Design a protein around this nucleic acid. Sequence first.
RNA 1: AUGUUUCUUCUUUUUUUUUUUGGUGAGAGG
RNA 2: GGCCGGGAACUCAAAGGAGACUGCCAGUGAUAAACUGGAGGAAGGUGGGGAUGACGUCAAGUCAUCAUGGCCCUUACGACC
RNA 3: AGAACCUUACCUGGUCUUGACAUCCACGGAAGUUUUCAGAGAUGAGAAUGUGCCUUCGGGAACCGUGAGACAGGUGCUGCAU
Lengths: 157, 105, 124, 206
Amino acid sequence: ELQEKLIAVNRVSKTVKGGRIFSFTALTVVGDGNGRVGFGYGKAREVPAAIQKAMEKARRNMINVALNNGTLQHPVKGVHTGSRVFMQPASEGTGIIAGGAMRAVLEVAGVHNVLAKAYGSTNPINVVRATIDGLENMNSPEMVAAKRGKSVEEILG
Amino acid sequence: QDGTFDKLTKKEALMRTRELEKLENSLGGIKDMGGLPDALFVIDADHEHIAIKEANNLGIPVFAIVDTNSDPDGVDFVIPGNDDAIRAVTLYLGAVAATVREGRS
Amino acid sequence: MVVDQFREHEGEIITGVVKKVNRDNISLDLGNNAEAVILREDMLPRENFRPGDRVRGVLYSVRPEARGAQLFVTRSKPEMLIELFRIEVPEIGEEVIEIKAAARDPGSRAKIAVKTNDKRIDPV
Amino acid sequence: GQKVHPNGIRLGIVKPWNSTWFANTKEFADNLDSDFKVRQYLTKELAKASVSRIVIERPAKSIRVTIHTARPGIVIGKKGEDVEKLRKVVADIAGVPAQINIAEVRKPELDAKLVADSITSQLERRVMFRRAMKRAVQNAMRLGAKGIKVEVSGRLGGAEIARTEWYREGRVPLHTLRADIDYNTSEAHTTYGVIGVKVWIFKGEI
RNA sequence: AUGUUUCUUCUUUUUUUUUUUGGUGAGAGG
RNA sequence: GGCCGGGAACUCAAAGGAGACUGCCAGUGAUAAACUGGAGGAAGGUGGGGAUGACGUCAAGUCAUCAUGGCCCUUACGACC
RNA sequence: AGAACCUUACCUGGUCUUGACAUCCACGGAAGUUUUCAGAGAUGAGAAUGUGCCUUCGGGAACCGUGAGACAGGUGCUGCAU
């Protein structure tokens, strides 16, 4: 159903006059594997609650990408604050490789053929914002035949 | 309405009526609502901006009377009209009540 | 007064112990000297109850008859399906999801139609 | 130096004492002597019998012990012959006929003592102590007891440095003596130390 | 105005009950 | 010599409770909160006092109340006068 | 919450080392009881005599000795091992 896949764990603290209490920022991703992708932001005072509180936002953050034949459409820029990752096309290259801590994200969209390279600063947090944002402004050939040209079949040849 | 005094002291129960009444007028007659409705009507978006933010995240279509000073960044149905009148808002409320007269059958 | 206090149970899925099995009905003991009946038409076609078995069913009718059973319980009617979904699906008990219609072929197949006003919830 | 027992401040006003009988100062001794060392021998054998409280009420020239367990089937064992075996080893010790009251509880899992030695019965073999507690804590929460703050102590996780943490769920009265909350403690001595336990399970009010 | 040195950690797996109104004496029927 | 009768008024003796809450009055103040005067009362603003020591800091002390992992003595560091 | 012996764990000297105390193994002594002593006391050197109940009555629990012991004993250290 939601096809969970969980990745992140690292301490953050507060440093009060009592001391520094280790909160646990933990991230994951939720999706069908056939078009609906969207994640949640979670943290707690331990590990197993944070992966459970991140679930509810991921139920309401699923954003569709019009999965064409279980892959992308065309090379799009996933530039966001900290990472400038490209979404390189590979039309049934039959290779599922993306960035570190992006690979486990792009198992839940379902694809099997795409290339990537996380340009800039190697951060796991700007990935999951950008790897949906790269997927967001991406559009299948029908929608960008629905707007440009005003002749759907002529860009289709 | 029958008891509520003979189970503790009389001093306590006026705090309860303070708790009852101020949560009566502020929770309204909305206790028998369905919890999550299908639409919400907005009269003015200046300081009720938290609603049109919150009503947009669940995909619920919600309306808006706009005046000169507020922004359409978030509302769905921008309708013009001055938000400072007594009978005219009821003329708006009498207009929707004609629709809600069909909104029962 | 116990039946009045159990206004929910009079309509929801009451639980009884099978006291007696006849050809045409099953007598349930609900406790407190309350007896209910499941009629043959109110049973599922493949159910076999024994004296001492626990049975759930919807209290669909209360009759103030001077003789006989006063509490009529069904397992075959659509109300049994609706109330089982109300108990098993919190979102129906919280009125977030509404069951609009239910059609049933008892012990074989049913259909339920569900609606929600919250666009964030998939009712199915 | 913290944490006074809400037990000892509330004995008698809401909850009955763990011993009630009169004595003079002169016979304060011999009455006292019997109580400890046979409860020592009670806790040696009925450790696995899941017991909650042992109130010993011994009147002048008399003694009665109200044993409060939940599995008396292993206390009586078979045909109650083991109950007299509790009685033959106490009669020639205190010199007085000591009659035994095994007055049971219908509900074992809503008791302060049983949850304490629950983790202690499973501490010997290394368990993730959180889930071990969580199970009992949740069970005791849903079963009606409206408040629980539960403790473990020692060197948890095979640790070396000092560690203690508690799990709050519900109401905990320590400045309201009117309400009803119990507490117990046992220990776990093994090949790695003493790994201890406290609990504060809340029942109710007037 | 002054206040060494090398030293502190971090969270997702363990848990069966339940208890083995008799005697004696007389008469009579077959 | 309350010592000897008598008495159930009364101090004392000891129990279950009645008794206090900003309840009421007026000024002021945002119809609120609220301070404090007026009243009676045994007591007037948590009536005087005690008990209860939140999350936690000093990784504050104790192995010499007791428990207890390693360590060593175990013809001694253990035991007796 | 009270340092003459004690408490006392420190010191001098004189002492037993399976031991002040615990359970068990073989066997003995029954257990018990007053008193004369080398001696600072410890400990050790002795003399008179006794013997309740169950008796599966080829002896056993309550008490100590001598011998092997497993252990027993630890106010000896580590409070930053709990």
